Amino acid sequence: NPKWERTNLTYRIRNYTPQLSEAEVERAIKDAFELWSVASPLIFTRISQGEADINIAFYQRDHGDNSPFDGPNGILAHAFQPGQGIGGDAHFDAEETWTNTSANYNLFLVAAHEFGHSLGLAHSSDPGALMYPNYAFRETSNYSLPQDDIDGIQAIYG
Ligand SMILES: C[C@H](NC(=O)[C@@H](CS)Cc1ccccc1)C(=O)NCC(N)=O
Ligand SMILES: [Ca+2]
Ligand SMILES: [Ca+2]
Ligand SMILES: [Zn+2]
Ligand SMILES: [Zn+2]
């Protein structure tokens, strides 16, 4: 069980995707962190620069981590388990079509999935869970965490 021993964690959006405005990217990320906050003791703080616990970036193919992305579709992003350095960081494939609609792919939902990994959760076999290996659109307007995901952060933190 890798987990954060601290409860206030900072994050930094290193770069942006040109497909969305910055406000939309910052909003997608903010809301994604709030789904976890409301079901756990974690507080997320955004820093405009400096070293953050969780770095967020949009990278392409080879991007320095031995986990090369793969062009459109296929893997959409990845995140690292709780830890120092690359630990906790979440990378998104810059070659995907990021949206904030029902069109593939919706950034808030992929960010919400990735942040689960950053907090120590693995994939779930429950197709209704957000932590399920494959993406599926779910309305995001007043989106809330599936019970399985809630069971998951609750088991690591409290
Ligand atoms: C397999 C691939 N999965 C991924 O890229 C996940 C790697 S941690 C990210 C993910 C998973 C579920 C919900 C949102 C984001 C995927 O779903 N690709 C898109 C597809 N379904 O067409
Ligand atoms: Ca891809
Ligand atoms: Ca980190
Ligand atoms: Zn990466
Ligand atoms: Zn995943």
Report the separation in Å between the CA atom of 87 and the middle of ligand 5, taken as the mean of its atom positions: 15
Could you tell me the CA-to-CA distances from 151 to 96, 112, 131 in Å, in that order?
30, 15, 11
- Pairing between strand 43-46 and 54-59? unpaired
> Which residues have a Cβ under 8 Å from the Cβ of 85 and sit 6 or more positions away?
none
Q: Tell the residue nearest (CA) to atom 16 of ligand 1.
A: 134
The neighbourhood of ligand 2, an ion, using CB within 5 A, equals 70, 74-75, 93
Other Cβ atoms closer than 10 A to 2: 12
* Residues labelled as active-site residues: 114
Structural domain total, the chain: 1
List, in sequence order, every beta strand (DSSP E) within the chain. 8-13, 43-46, 54-59, 77-79, 90-93
Return d(Cα 53, Cα 6) in angstroms, integer. Answer: 10
31 backbone dihedrals φ, ψ, rounded to 5°: -55, -30
Peptide bond into 105 cis (omega under 30): yes
Counting Cα atoms < 13 Å in the Cβ hemisphere of 113 gives: 26
Residue type, 115: F
Report the separation in Å between the CA atom of 45 and the middle of ligand 5, taken as the mean of its atom positions: 23
Domain that holds residue 103: 1-158
Return d(Cα 132, Cα 140) in angstroms, integer. Answer: 17
State the CATH number of the domain containing residue 97: 3.40.390.10
Could you tell me the CA-to-CA distances from 99 to 48, 76, 106, 130 in Å, in that order?
23, 13, 5, 18
- Method for structure elucidation: X-ray
The resolution in angstroms reads: 2.4
Q: Which of 75, 43, 41, 50 is nearest to 60 (CA)?
A: 75
Q: Considering every ligand atom shown, identify the ligand nearest to the alpha carbon of residue 96 and give its number.
A: 2
